[PDB]
Amino acid sequence: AMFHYTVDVSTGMNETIERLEESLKQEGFGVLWQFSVTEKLQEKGLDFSTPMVILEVCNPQEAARVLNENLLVGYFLPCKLVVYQENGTTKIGMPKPTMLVGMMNDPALKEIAADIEKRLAACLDRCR
């Protein structure tokens, strides 16, 4: 299936990030790190002009939950979200936790990933 979940939002980059942080907070997720990919590359004189910001988010209890079931899940932490502007429109997307964890061949872990995916998806929908 589609490896990612992406939504179109009416707001610009800055306000989208603002609203996403509030939506995540409502769900117990905190932003651990924000990285402006576009800035990092353009500062190096590289040719990449699409505005794009990557956010590493985390809900401590959810992290502990998955790590205590399978240590290798750390290879997919923290949860990643990406806010970018394509064709003059802003979007928020994320690789699906169930697709990432699915590669691990751990049925039970994938079901916990599904809970996480549902919550992150809800956070994204609130930003439409």
Interface residue list for a second copy (CB under 8 A): 3-4, 32-33, 35, 37, 40-41, 44, 46-48, 50, 52, 54, 56, 58, 60-61, 63-64, 67-68, 71-72, 74-78, 80, 82, 84, 86, 93-95, 99-100, 103-104
- E strand residue ranges, 1-128: 4-9, 30-36, 52-58, 79-86, 89-95
Q: Which does 106 bind (CB under 5 to 8 A by kind): Zn ion, a second copy, none?
A: none
Tokens of 29: 């997720």
Q: Which of 8, 18, 22, 86 binds Zn ion (CB under 5 A)?
A: 18
Q: Which does 60 bind (CB under 5 to 8 A by kind): a second copy, Zn ion, none?
A: a second copy
Q: Which does 7 bind (CB under 5 to 8 A by kind): Zn ion, a second copy, none?
A: none
Three-state DSSP at 100 gives helix
Q: Which of 59, 73, 81, 94 binds Zn ion (CB under 5 A)?
A: 59
Q: How many CB atoms lie within 10 A of CB 5?
A: 18
125 interacts with Zn ion by CB under 5 A: yes
Asked if 53 and 37 touch (Cβ cutoff 8 Å), the reply is yes
Contacts of 25 (CB under 8 A, 6+ apart): none
Q: Which does 115 bind (CB under 5 to 8 A by kind): Zn ion, a second copy, none?
A: Zn ion
Judged by the rule CB under 5 A, the positions of this chain that interact with Zn ion are 18, 21, 31, 39, 43, 58-59, 62-63, 79, 115, 125
